[PDB]
Amino acid sequence: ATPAYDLQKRDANNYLLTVSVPGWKEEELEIETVGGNLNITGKHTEETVEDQTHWIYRGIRKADFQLSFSLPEHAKVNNAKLEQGLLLVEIYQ
Amino acid sequence: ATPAYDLQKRDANNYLLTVSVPGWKEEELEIETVGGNLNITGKHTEETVEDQTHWIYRGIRKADFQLSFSLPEHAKVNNAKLEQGLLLVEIYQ
Amino acid sequence: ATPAYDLQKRDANNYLLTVSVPGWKEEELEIETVGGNLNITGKHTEETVEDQTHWIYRGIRKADFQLSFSLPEHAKVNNAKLEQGLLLVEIYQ
Amino acid sequence: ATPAYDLQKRDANNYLLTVSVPGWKEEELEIETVGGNLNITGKHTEETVEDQTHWIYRGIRKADFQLSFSLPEHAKVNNAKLEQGLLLVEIYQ
Amino acid sequence: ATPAYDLQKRDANNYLLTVSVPGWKEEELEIETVGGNLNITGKHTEETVEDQTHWIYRGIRKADFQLSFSLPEHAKVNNAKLEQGLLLVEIYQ
Amino acid sequence: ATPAYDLQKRDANNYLLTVSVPGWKEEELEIETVGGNLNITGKHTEETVEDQTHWIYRGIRKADFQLSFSLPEHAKVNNAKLEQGLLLVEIYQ
Amino acid sequence: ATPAYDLQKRDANNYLLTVSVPGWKEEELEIETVGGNLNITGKHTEETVEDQTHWIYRGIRKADFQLSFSLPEHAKVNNAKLEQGLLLVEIYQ
Amino acid sequence: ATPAYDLQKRDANNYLLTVSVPGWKEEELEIETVGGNLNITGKHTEETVEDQTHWIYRGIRKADFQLSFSLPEHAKVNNAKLEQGLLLVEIYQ
Amino acid sequence: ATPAYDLQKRDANNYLLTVSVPGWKEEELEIETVGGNLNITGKHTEETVEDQTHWIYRGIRKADFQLSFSLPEHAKVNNAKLEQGLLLVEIYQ
Amino acid sequence: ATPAYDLQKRDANNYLLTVSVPGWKEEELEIETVGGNLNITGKHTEETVEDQTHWIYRGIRKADFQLSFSLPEHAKVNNAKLEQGLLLVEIYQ
Amino acid sequence: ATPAYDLQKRDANNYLLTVSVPGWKEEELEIETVGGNLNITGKHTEETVEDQTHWIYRGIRKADFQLSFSLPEHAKVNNAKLEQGLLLVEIYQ
Amino acid sequence: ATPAYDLQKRDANNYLLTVSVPGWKEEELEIETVGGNLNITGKHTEETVEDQTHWIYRGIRKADFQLSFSLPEHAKVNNAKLEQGLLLVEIYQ
Amino acid sequence: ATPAYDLQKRDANNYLLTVSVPGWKEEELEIETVGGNLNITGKHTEETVEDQTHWIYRGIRKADFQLSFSLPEHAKVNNAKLEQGLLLVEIYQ
Amino acid sequence: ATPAYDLQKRDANNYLLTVSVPGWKEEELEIETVGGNLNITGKHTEETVEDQTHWIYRGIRKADFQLSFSLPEHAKVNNAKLEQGLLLVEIYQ
Amino acid sequence: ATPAYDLQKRDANNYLLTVSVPGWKEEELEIETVGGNLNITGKHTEETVEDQTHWIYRGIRKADFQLSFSLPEHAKVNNAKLEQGLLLVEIYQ
Amino acid sequence: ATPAYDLQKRDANNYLLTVSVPGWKEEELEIETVGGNLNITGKHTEETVEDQTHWIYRGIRKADFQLSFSLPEHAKVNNAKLEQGLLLVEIYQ
Amino acid sequence: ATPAYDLQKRDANNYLLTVSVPGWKEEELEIETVGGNLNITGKHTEETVEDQTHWIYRGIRKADFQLSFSLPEHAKVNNAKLEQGLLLVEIYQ
Amino acid sequence: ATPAYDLQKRDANNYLLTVSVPGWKEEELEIETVGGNLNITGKHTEETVEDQTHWIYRGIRKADFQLSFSLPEHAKVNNAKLEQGLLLVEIYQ
């Protein structure tokens, strides 16, 4: 199960990342980077005392996943603005 | 192939639904009911400029959609609030 | 949809690449390399004023795709000879 | 699982067919018709030396094949020309 | 067909590898590493004069596969102890 | 989805079975027959400590299993020996 | 697979429902009338530890269901008594 | 009308047969064993005066049945129990 | 066995019923109503001693009958007239 | 359209006749005997203005019929008795 | 229960009768002629203590019957012959 | 065409057989046995000249017959008695 | 093979006979009356060399038949008229 | 309703047709042809006044008929002869 | 799913084709005869903008087809007129 | 033979019902509404004289039908239109 | 797909097996009795080189099978002779 | 009962027809060709006296068949061969 994602290029020294992230909580998330590389981990909050009579249908899997990536020599980041369940990341090379 | 979604209940009058829909603007999505039934339409803003050269990968198709539902006579909510590709509708019975 | 491909090794300092490329036009193609790495993009010519009565069956998808690859430190190329829809590339390390 | 192929018409006597078949020699492929019908056979040159050690990956199997077709009485073409894993047959009505 | 495998992390400078390898023979295996990187190849012994009346069912594919990996700069190994068809490798960074 | 396994015969009294089961301890697996039938159970040692944080990837689930077989009256083997996720049972007729 | 069904009437001011309900507990199914309709909901006791060896044969499957029923004018419900797998519920007009 | 059945094993001196048997009375069913097997005869109670008006739809046929089962060498029985339309028969070694 | 029956002329708010019933006695016929709606059953009196020689063949079946319909809300009835084996019944809604 | 018949016996000098005969007019039936047999002729009545709406269902058909009878040596006749739209007619043989 | 019949002819002053007639007692059958015909009355025997186990299958039914006959002018009778549980009875016409 | 037949009373180790067979000759019947088990076929003698006028209608089919059953191991037989078209056969196991 | 029959009436001293009777030879049919009835005997013709190819379909069968008749008191006869392969035969009663 | 019919003997190039048709008039029969091929329909003349008493039972259906076949190219016909209700028709191809 | 079909003939030099064609335009289907065969090809008008909300229900599907028909010797085509969904095309021999 | 139908909505004051209705005439169909619903009666034109020879195969049955549909509270109609065998009925709010 | 089957008995000490076996060689099938059961095993000759062009049509599939059969007490086997596709094997009790 | 068949081509002057034909004799089958096609008639040998006791189950129906096949312009035959229930017919150009 691979979550949809987006990636755009802007020129040879700039790239643009867009990530689809509807429904995830802040508490479900913790950061990281290891050896000039890049590590990606997802944890979705363990579900609450929410009555399944109240829960009618669950088509959205809200589970967990984990990715780790060597950053090709040598990419760098700049800021993170999050908006409307889509992820926008500015990248200062 | 079924859409991913989640649904929980809160109290006797209110429900919480989770569907993955990242990046949509309040103009890209619209709420509707008509005397017995109910329709859900996402009408995505005129898309911005899209270059399959810019697009490195398009895993998120973000275009319009349309869902439709019967209203039992005669239930009501309270307001519609939108956030992080997740939708909040207060429903008062 | 992954196009078939071939790869052979010759020894520890030589490798041999064979690519399957039947039907692609010169105008459908443009080159590249970014940051001592390697980028691969496919564009198939937008189809012509070709009458579909004349077109009997289309089993060959002739669409577009795009790949980008960091060259592991540090590979280099030598010439390109193209023959019979198969791709033969000599590689001078 | 159907083979990828394409077919276009040119004029009242001629057609253009596209099938993906890279690397074949005129001896690896042969054209045939016999009084009412028609057979297409690819008979691949005695393969060259193939070492699964050389082979890093074999996505292209390049061995013989056989296709067969009825001829309506009594149609004709003009010549058979082969190029870039694509086949050109001029057909004169 | 991807063989199951396992991987654990211990901290930022240590990793733990576990590989599932039931049924493979010593003679089916030969080692390697190319350009500060890592190459992985599998060869299962060509099957013996073993009578198929005696062979009742073959659900285990015992065939061959091949992987090659650049070691990200710059990982190193320490010893190999093999036990119960699972692979345990100590890794001295 | 069928389990991968292999089965060969040796002599008139003995058979060799190959199933992929890496890492199991003699306490994680148990042999059984009961007057006409036969049961095969893998009962995996109380698992050790498992942290989905430690777990980078879990492709091997190593928990208990249970298989069951009728014994024709009245066949016998000789001993049960376990090695490298492969099982050896000498069977004397 | 469409489920089988029974239902009787007793007179113009009464209806009699007769249902075949083998093996069920009172806690495994519950009645509710919710403004115009009567709903019969089945919820099966938390499974106890049951060894599948202890099960020699299970041809009998035991689950639940939920249906809501408009009371015909003007139906009323009265008691629920269960006997010989048959369940008796008076519905009164 | 013959009953569904289930078998089950319960422990080393016990097995469990489960049969689906709703609405049948103890007196309408009778036990007999004859020479190596076991014969079960059902004589279903005479219907009562039953007004087909009371029957909205009569899908259930209330008649008699008779089953016979070999007692495998050499099972012994303990007690025949019927409840909520499933019939449970324990088998002792 | 259904009686031949007729429904004829009366009014827009009147219906006229005709049933073919030659030879029937009041005592062989008996009336009975059970809420809104209405059901008619015929039981012909125990005759005087009648030899089957007297009744050569029953082509006419003189037994029991049953028929059932829904009333549009809320129709009513006016008189019952019998004539020439034909039944004239005015029904006023 | 000939009339459906039943017949009965009274005695050698007496006979009783039962016939389910809806409709008939004594003035629309006429008697005649001709040379050894007996002939009975039935008519109908002039159709009155009869609206086709008032006839809902004709189960009783009124048309024409034709039959002829003779006396065996040496037969004779008794009385004519009429009853419950059934006729009772004695002859004498 | 009336007896299944076959009949045969001998001659005008003679007749032979075959009837498959299991059971009957000459003393349980009695002759009488009444005014033009002939009447034959059959009885049965007092039921003895008869256990219902000994009767495995009644294919032969013994009940009561009733029949009446007459002589045409001018008929007469011959003899009564009895044979193989078949009766041979001559009259004379 | 099967003979009517009966099986009646004798003992717990005796069976009594009754077949309805009026009019059959010893010569029309013939016995034959072929190992353990046992098969009975009837061929009624070529009659004397018999006109089909003599046999008005065969309602009784006087031809050939065949019936086959398994003996519980190992039953036996005792005498054969014929009476009133009814057959009395004692069978002793 | 007996002939298919139809019959008609003319009058008490006259009768007309229609029978669909293909084949018959006046010389192959012979009349005889015997004691109260009338007997009509039909023959056929000597088979000529008749090739089986010329007979494509026999729908008309020619075999033998046998029938016997008597006069009631007191009957008589009229004429014999022959018509359209249909016979017209008057008697007189 | 198909006429019995026959096809008999004539030649290798001649066919002979026989239809069973006793009682039919030329006026009850009528010929008609519509290109190559050929279709025959029979309409029996309005008879003279004929009472259904005159025709006891129609076992013979004297109505209309229709039959259709393909001619091998290109057969022809020669004469039509009628005899003994049997039809003799020579057909010459 | 095999499509339904109609076809009529008119006489030996004519054929009449009758087809049920609801909702179709003349531009949506086209006739062509192409050397021995007649081909009826259907091509449906470019879809207009149609709101699926504007569609309450579509049980009626509207597409096209293509078939080529050998003219029987010696068929000819004549006009195409459409009415009440029925289409009439004369095919003449 | 009852017609396929489609529904459709057309705008806020309109809905569209589409019914497949080929070959039916306006005069053979009649409209009536009765107390909460709507009743549609089809009386399909009397077939014409139709030669089954003209019918090569007659799969279409030309008979009468009658449909009734509740007008949901409280739809109003505009005009009933039939074309090319589809019937379109617009519904106005 | 369940395979068809034949089997005959010859007498109480004999059984006769008859099987339809078209195209098979003696080497393609083999008999074996293995302690209580008789097993018939089919093994088809090594395929020869067969050109699929040389095959115009193959509606006949040729494989093998293996079944083991309990000899009924007390069956014995005797010879195997094959003729006209039928195979004859005596099984003797 | 008609036979499966296979076709096959064998070389440039040969084709192979393979038909499944078990148990049929040469004399029961006969060849004839008639004007453009080929007709094969099977007349299957008269069954022998066959004891249905010898038949444990008779799934095979031993009757006659007849096949006809057009010899495409213009195939010629060589020899008809039957073996082990498959029928092989070689076709020569």
Residue numbers in the entry:
A (entry chain F), B (entry chain E), C (entry chain F), D (entry chain E), E (entry chain F), F (entry chain E), ...: 40 to 132
Task: Quote the study's own text.
AgsA:DD crystallized in the R32 space group with 3 dimers in the asymmetric unit (ASU). The application of the crystallographic 3-fold axis yields a closed 18-mer, with a dimer lying along each side of a trigonal bipyramid. Thus, the 18-mer formed by nine dimers has a 32 symmetry. When this structure was used as a search model, an unambiguous MR solution of 3 dimers in the ASU was obtained, with clear and well-defined density for the β-sheets. The outer surface of the oligomer is charged, and its interior is hydrophobic. Though the IXI motifs in the C-termini of the 18-mer could not be defined for any monomer, the positioning of the monomers at inter-dimer interfaces indicates that the C-terminal regions are poised to form the hydrophobic interactions with the neighbouring β4–β8 clefts.
Small Heat Shock Proteins (sHSPs) are ATP-independent chaperones which prevent irreversible protein aggregation by binding to misfolded substrate proteins. Most sHSPs exist as large oligomers which undergo drastic rearrangement or dissociation into dimers upon activation during stress, in order to execute their chaperone function.
